[PDB]
Design a protein around this ligand. Structure first.
Ligand SMILES: O=S(=O)([O-])CCC[n+]1ccccc1CCO
Length: 105
């Protein structure tokens, strides 16, 4: 359990099949059950990328990390009232550093 852990940073990730995190912090997750998470958001002022460790038995941003067992971080759209974002989780080393915006691969 070893993840990029910069929390929410500005990003230029847009209109590409995959993105790097460009996060310089790689952390040992505090608890062994934790997985890596990436969250991509765009509003009319900026794009951000959030990278953390998170326990997948706990919701994150009001969603369950159903993909926690995956070695790769495959972005999927999350829609709630007021906000749409993209999120993925994964459980291989620094896997939230290689963020894939496709299911084609
Ligand atoms: O802002 S949007 O509504 O179009 C969602 C964009 C989703 N997204 C984010 C970042 C990189 C790539 C993609 C899609 C693949 O090109």
């Amino acid at each position: 359990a070893l993840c990029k852990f910069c929390d929410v940073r500005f990003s230029t990730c847009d209109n590409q099949k995959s993105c790097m995190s460009n996060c310089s912090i790689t952390s040992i997750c505090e608890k062994p059950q934790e997985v890596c998470v990436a969250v991509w958001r765009k509003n009319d002022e900026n794009i951000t990328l959030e990278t953390v460790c998170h326990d997948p038995k706990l919701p994150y941003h009001d969603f369950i990390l159903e993909d926690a067992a995956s070695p790769t971080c495959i972005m999927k759209e999350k829609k709630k009232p007021g906000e749409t974002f993209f999120m993925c989780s994964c459980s291989s080393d620094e896997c939230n550093d290689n963020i894939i915006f496709s299911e084609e691969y």
